[PDB]
Structure 1
Amino acid sequence: SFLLSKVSFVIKKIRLEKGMTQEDLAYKSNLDRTYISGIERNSRNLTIKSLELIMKGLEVSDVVFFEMLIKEILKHD
Protein backbone atom coordinates (compact mmCIF):
# COMPACT_ATOMS: atom_id res chain seq x y z
CA SER A 1 0.00 0.00 0.00
CA PHE A 2 0.96 3.64 -0.18
CA LEU A 3 1.19 3.63 3.69
CA LEU A 4 3.62 0.68 3.87
CA SER A 5 5.79 2.20 1.09
CA LYS A 6 5.87 5.59 2.71
CA VAL A 7 6.73 4.34 6.22
CA SER A 8 9.79 2.88 4.51
CA PHE A 9 10.41 5.99 2.46
CA VAL A 10 10.29 8.31 5.52
CA ILE A 11 12.82 6.08 7.43
CA LYS A 12 15.18 6.11 4.53
CA LYS A 13 14.71 9.78 3.84
CA ILE A 14 15.54 10.78 7.46
CA ARG A 15 18.46 8.34 7.58
CA LEU A 16 20.05 9.87 4.52
CA GLU A 17 19.27 13.48 5.58
CA LYS A 18 21.27 12.64 8.66
CA GLY A 19 24.14 11.18 6.75
CA MET A 20 23.69 7.74 8.22
CA THR A 21 24.40 4.35 6.57
CA GLN A 22 22.14 1.34 7.18
CA GLU A 23 24.96 -0.03 9.27
CA ASP A 24 24.98 3.15 11.47
CA LEU A 25 21.19 3.05 11.90
CA ALA A 26 21.37 -0.62 12.87
CA TYR A 27 23.85 0.05 15.60
CA LYS A 28 21.96 3.08 16.93
CA SER A 29 18.56 1.41 16.81
CA ASN A 30 19.57 -1.93 18.31
CA LEU A 31 18.24 -3.78 15.22
CA ASP A 32 20.50 -5.67 12.93
CA ARG A 33 21.55 -4.38 9.55
CA THR A 34 19.58 -6.97 7.54
CA TYR A 35 16.45 -6.01 9.47
CA ILE A 36 16.97 -2.31 8.63
CA SER A 37 17.56 -3.11 4.93
CA GLY A 38 14.44 -5.26 4.87
CA ILE A 39 12.16 -2.70 6.49
CA GLU A 40 13.39 -0.05 4.09
CA ARG A 41 12.28 -2.31 1.25
CA ASN A 42 8.93 -3.28 2.83
CA SER A 43 7.63 -2.04 6.22
CA ARG A 44 4.74 -4.67 6.45
CA ASN A 45 6.22 -6.55 9.39
CA LEU A 46 7.88 -3.59 11.19
CA THR A 47 6.44 -3.45 14.73
CA ILE A 48 5.59 -0.36 16.76
CA LYS A 49 8.44 -1.22 19.20
CA SER A 50 10.92 -1.50 16.31
CA LEU A 51 9.69 1.77 14.85
CA GLU A 52 10.29 3.47 18.16
CA LEU A 53 13.83 2.00 18.21
CA ILE A 54 14.43 3.30 14.72
CA MET A 55 13.16 6.79 15.64
CA LYS A 56 15.54 6.83 18.60
CA GLY A 57 18.43 5.64 16.33
CA LEU A 58 17.58 8.45 13.86
CA GLU A 59 17.30 10.94 16.75
CA VAL A 60 13.91 12.16 15.50
CA SER A 61 10.93 12.56 17.70
CA ASP A 62 7.84 10.46 17.10
CA VAL A 63 5.87 13.66 16.44
CA VAL A 64 8.19 14.73 13.67
CA PHE A 65 8.23 11.24 12.13
CA PHE A 66 4.48 11.03 12.08
CA GLU A 67 4.10 14.57 10.72
CA MET A 68 6.51 13.78 7.81
CA LEU A 69 4.39 10.62 7.12
CA ILE A 70 1.16 12.61 7.14
CA LYS A 71 2.65 15.18 4.76
CA GLU A 72 3.73 12.43 2.38
CA ILE A 73 0.21 10.90 2.39
CA LEU A 74 -1.58 14.23 1.95
CA LYS A 75 0.62 15.50 -0.79
CA HIS A 76 1.22 12.26 -2.73
CA ASP A 77 -1.71 9.85 -2.12
Structure 2
Amino acid sequence: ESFLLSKVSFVIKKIRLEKGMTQEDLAYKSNLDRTYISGIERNSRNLTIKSLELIMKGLEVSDVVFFEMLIKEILK
Protein backbone atom coordinates (compact mmCIF):
# COMPACT_ATOMS: atom_id res chain seq x y z
CA GLU A 1 0.00 0.00 0.00
CA SER A 2 0.81 3.72 -0.02
CA PHE A 3 2.17 6.07 2.63
CA LEU A 4 0.03 9.01 1.59
CA LEU A 5 -3.04 6.87 1.26
CA SER A 6 -2.49 5.67 4.82
CA LYS A 7 -2.05 9.14 6.21
CA VAL A 8 -5.11 10.31 4.32
CA SER A 9 -7.15 7.51 5.85
CA PHE A 10 -5.72 8.13 9.27
CA VAL A 11 -6.61 11.80 8.96
CA ILE A 12 -10.17 10.99 7.87
CA LYS A 13 -10.54 8.76 10.92
CA LYS A 14 -8.86 11.33 13.21
CA ILE A 15 -11.23 14.13 12.22
CA ARG A 16 -14.21 11.82 12.45
CA LEU A 17 -13.30 11.09 16.08
CA GLU A 18 -12.39 14.61 17.25
CA LYS A 19 -15.90 15.44 16.04
CA GLY A 20 -17.38 12.46 17.90
CA MET A 21 -18.85 10.98 14.70
CA THR A 22 -19.58 7.38 13.97
CA GLN A 23 -18.78 5.83 10.57
CA GLU A 24 -22.48 5.25 10.13
CA ASP A 25 -23.00 8.96 10.57
CA LEU A 26 -20.03 9.92 8.41
CA ALA A 27 -21.52 7.89 5.58
CA TYR A 28 -25.04 9.35 6.08
CA LYS A 29 -23.64 12.87 6.05
CA SER A 30 -21.73 12.50 2.83
CA ASN A 31 -24.10 10.09 1.08
CA LEU A 32 -21.66 7.24 0.57
CA ASP A 33 -21.75 3.63 1.72
CA ARG A 34 -20.78 2.83 5.30
CA THR A 35 -18.77 -0.19 4.20
CA TYR A 36 -17.06 2.18 1.81
CA ILE A 37 -16.07 4.46 4.67
CA SER A 38 -15.08 1.53 6.81
CA GLY A 39 -12.83 0.35 4.02
CA ILE A 40 -10.98 3.62 3.67
CA GLU A 41 -10.31 3.83 7.43
CA ARG A 42 -8.86 0.32 7.51
CA ASN A 43 -6.83 1.64 4.56
CA SER A 44 -8.30 -0.79 2.03
CA ARG A 45 -9.33 1.92 -0.43
CA ASN A 46 -7.50 4.12 -2.86
CA LEU A 47 -9.92 6.96 -3.16
CA THR A 48 -10.20 9.56 -5.84
CA ILE A 49 -10.13 13.25 -5.22
CA LYS A 50 -13.86 13.36 -5.88
CA SER A 51 -14.52 10.85 -3.17
CA LEU A 52 -12.08 12.50 -0.83
CA GLU A 53 -14.07 15.66 -1.41
CA LEU A 54 -17.35 14.08 -0.50
CA ILE A 55 -15.81 12.83 2.71
CA MET A 56 -14.54 16.27 3.62
CA LYS A 57 -18.02 17.67 3.10
CA GLY A 58 -19.39 14.87 5.24
CA LEU A 59 -16.83 15.66 7.92
CA GLU A 60 -17.80 19.34 7.63
CA VAL A 61 -14.24 20.40 7.06
CA SER A 62 -12.78 22.68 4.46
CA ASP A 63 -10.23 21.42 1.96
CA VAL A 64 -7.65 23.67 3.53
CA VAL A 65 -8.19 22.46 7.07
CA PHE A 66 -7.95 18.89 5.86
CA PHE A 67 -4.67 19.39 4.11
CA GLU A 68 -3.24 21.47 6.90
CA MET A 69 -3.92 18.42 9.04
CA LEU A 70 -2.72 15.96 6.48
CA ILE A 71 0.59 17.77 6.26
CA LYS A 72 1.05 17.71 9.99
CA GLU A 73 0.22 14.05 10.24
CA ILE A 74 2.66 13.36 7.39
CA LEU A 75 5.48 14.82 9.49
CA LYS A 76 5.43 12.06 12.16
- TM-score, normalised relative to structure 1: 0.90
Deviation at 1:69, TM superposition (A): 0.6
Cα deviation for residue 43 of structure 1 reads: 5.8
Alpha-carbon distance change, 70 to 43 in structure 1, aligned in 2, over 3 angstroms:
farther
Segments of structure 2 that go 5 or more residues without pairing to the other structure are none
Stretches (4+) displaced over 4 A: none
CA RMSD for the aligned pairs? 1.2
1:20-61 alpha-carbon deviations (Å, 9 max, x no partner): 000000000111100000011116421111110000000000
Q: Which 5+ residue runs of structure 1 have no aligned equivalent?
A: none
Task: Give 3-state SS (helix, strand or coil) of 1:72's partner.
Answer: helix
Greater helix share, 1 or 2? 1
Q: Secondary structure at the match of 2:24?
A: helix
